Amino acid sequence: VRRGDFVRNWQLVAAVPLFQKLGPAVLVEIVRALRARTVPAGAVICRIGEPGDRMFFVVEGSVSVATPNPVELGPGAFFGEMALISGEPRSATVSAATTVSLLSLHSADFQMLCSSSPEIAEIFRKTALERRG
Amino acid sequence: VRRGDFVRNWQLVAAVPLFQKLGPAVLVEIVRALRARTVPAGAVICRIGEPGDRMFFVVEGSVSVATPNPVELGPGAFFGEMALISGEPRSATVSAATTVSLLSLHSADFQMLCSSSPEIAEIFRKTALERRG
Numbered sequence: 322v323r324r325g326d327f328v329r330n331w332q333l334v335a336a337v338p339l340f341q342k343l344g345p346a347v348l349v350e351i352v353r354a355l356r357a358r359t360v361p362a363g364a365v366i367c368r369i370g371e372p373g374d375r376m377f378f379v380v381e382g383s384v385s386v387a388t389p390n391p392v393e394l395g396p397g398a399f400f401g402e403m404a405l406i407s408g409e410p411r412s413a414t415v416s417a418a419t420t421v422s423l424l425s426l427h428s429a430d431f432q433m434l435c436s437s438s439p440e441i442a443e444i445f446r447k448t449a450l451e452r453r454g
Numbered sequence: 455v456r457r458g459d460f461v462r463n464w465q466l467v468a469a470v471p472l473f474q475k476l477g478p479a480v481l482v483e484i485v486r487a488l489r490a491r492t493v494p495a496g497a498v499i500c501r502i503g504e505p506g507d508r509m510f511f512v513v514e515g516s517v518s519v520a521t522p523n524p525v526e527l528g529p530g531a532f533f534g535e536m537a538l539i540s541g542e543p544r545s546a547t548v549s550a551a552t553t554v555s556l557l558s559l560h561s562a563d564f565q566m567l568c569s570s571s572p573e574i575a576e577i578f579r580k581t582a583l584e585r586r587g
C-alpha cells in the first residue's frame with residue numbers, strides 16, 4: 322500500500338456513509354484494500370453476462386444500471402455486489418452516467434468486509450435481494 | 455479511540471506537512487493518538503514554568519510564543535516539544551493568537567512516534583535545540 326493512495330482513500334471513503342458503521346480497526350483494513358478509479362462518462366464498468374470478481378462504491382458522479390427501466394445510482398451507493406454474493410455472472414450492465422469517481426473492492430476483501438461487519442453484510446445481502454427480485 | 459474523532463483526525467493531520475514523512479502504519483498510530491482541540495483567541499495553551507506532558511501541532515490559525523521577542527507559529531508548526539525532550543517545565547507561555555485548531559500528542563505517544571520515525575525524532579531534537587536559549 323503506497324502512502325499517496327492510502328491517504329487519498331480517507332477523503333474518498335468519507336463520501337460513502339455506509340462506512341460510518343465501521344470502527345477504526347475495520348476502517349483501516351478497508352482503506353488499505355480499496356482501489357480508487359475515475360471512469361469517463363459512457364464507459365462500461367460491469368457488463369451483463371460477464372464474470373464478476375469485484376464490487377464498487379460511488380464517491381462522486383453517477384452510474385446507470387441497464388435494467389429494462391434503468392436505475393441511476395449516486396454517491397454512497399454500491400454495485401457489483403450480486404455477482405460476489407451469488408457467484409453468478411453480472412446481472413446487468415453498469416456504465417458511467419457522468420464522469421464518476423469510484424472505490425473498488427476485490428472479492429477476497431469483500432468477504433473480509435462482510436465478516437468484519439455483519440451489519441454491512443446484511444445491507445449487501447438485503448439490497449441484492451431487492452435488486453434480484 | 456472514538457470512531458468520529460478517528461475519522462476527523464485524518465483531514466486534520468493533512469494540515470501538518472511534517473506527517474508527510476510517515477508511512478501508512480505509523481500514520482494510523484498517530485491518528486489514533488492525536489487529540490483534536492480548539493482554543494479561542496487569546497487563551498493560554500501552556501504557561502511558562504508549568505509541567506508539560508504533551509506537545510501540539512497547529513492545524514488552523516496561529517499561536518504566539520511569549521519569548522522576549524514573541525514568535526508566531528502558524529499552520530503546520532509545532533510547539534511544546536521542549537518539555538518532552540528535556541523533561542523541564544514549559545520554557546515559555548504559548549497562547550492562541552487567533553482562534554486555533556490544534557492536535558495534541560501526549561508524552562507516551564510522543565515516545566512512540568520518535569521510535570516509529572527516526573527522521574521525525576531528529577527534527578524534534580534539532581528544533582528544540584535551536585529554540586532553546
Ligand SMILES: Nc1ncnc2c1ncn2[C@@H]1O[C@@H]2COP(=O)(O)O[C@H]2[C@H]1O
Pocket residue numbers: 367373386388392399400401402403404405410411412413414415451452453
Ligand atoms: N434492479 C436493480 N436496481 C439497481 N441496481 C441493480 C438492479 N439489478 C442489478 N443492479 C446492479 O448492477 C450490478 C450488475 O452486477 P452484479 O450482478 O454483480 O451486481 C449488480 C447490482 O449492483
Ligand SMILES: Nc1ncnc2c1ncn2[C@@H]1O[C@@H]2COP(=O)(O)O[C@H]2[C@H]1O
Pocket residue numbers: 500506519521525532533534535536537538543544545546547548584585586
Ligand atoms: N525561540 C523559540 N521559537 C519558537 N518556539 C519557541 C521558542 N522558545 C520556545 N518555543 C516554544 O514554546 C513552548 C513552551 O513549551 P516547551 O518548553 O515545552 O516547548 C516550547 C516550544 O515549542
Ligand SMILES: [Br-]
Pocket residue numbers: 345346349482
Ligand atoms: Br488499526
Ligand SMILES: [Br-]
Pocket residue numbers: 366367373374375
Ligand atoms: Br468489473
Ligand SMILES: [Br-]
Pocket residue numbers: 402403404406407449450453
Ligand atoms: Br444476490
Ligand SMILES: [Br-]
Pocket residue numbers: 356375376425426427
Ligand atoms: Br478491485
Ligand SMILES: [Br-]
Pocket residue numbers: 356358375425
Ligand atoms: Br476496478
Ligand SMILES: [Br-]
Pocket residue numbers: 328467468469473474
Ligand atoms: Br496527510
Ligand SMILES: [Br-]
Pocket residue numbers: 476477478479480481
Ligand atoms: Br509505515
Ligand SMILES: [Br-]
Pocket residue numbers: 349478479482
Ligand atoms: Br495499521
Ligand SMILES: [Br-]
Pocket residue numbers: 489491558
Ligand atoms: Br488533550
Ligand SMILES: [Br-]
Pocket residue numbers: 495496
Ligand atoms: Br486576544
Ligand SMILES: [Br-]
Pocket residue numbers: 493494497498
Ligand atoms: Br481555553
Ligand SMILES: [Br-]
Pocket residue numbers: none
Ligand atoms: Br488561570
Ligand SMILES: [Br-]
Pocket residue numbers: 499500506507508
Ligand atoms: Br499543556
Ligand SMILES: [Br-]
Pocket residue numbers: 514515516529
Ligand atoms: Br489559518
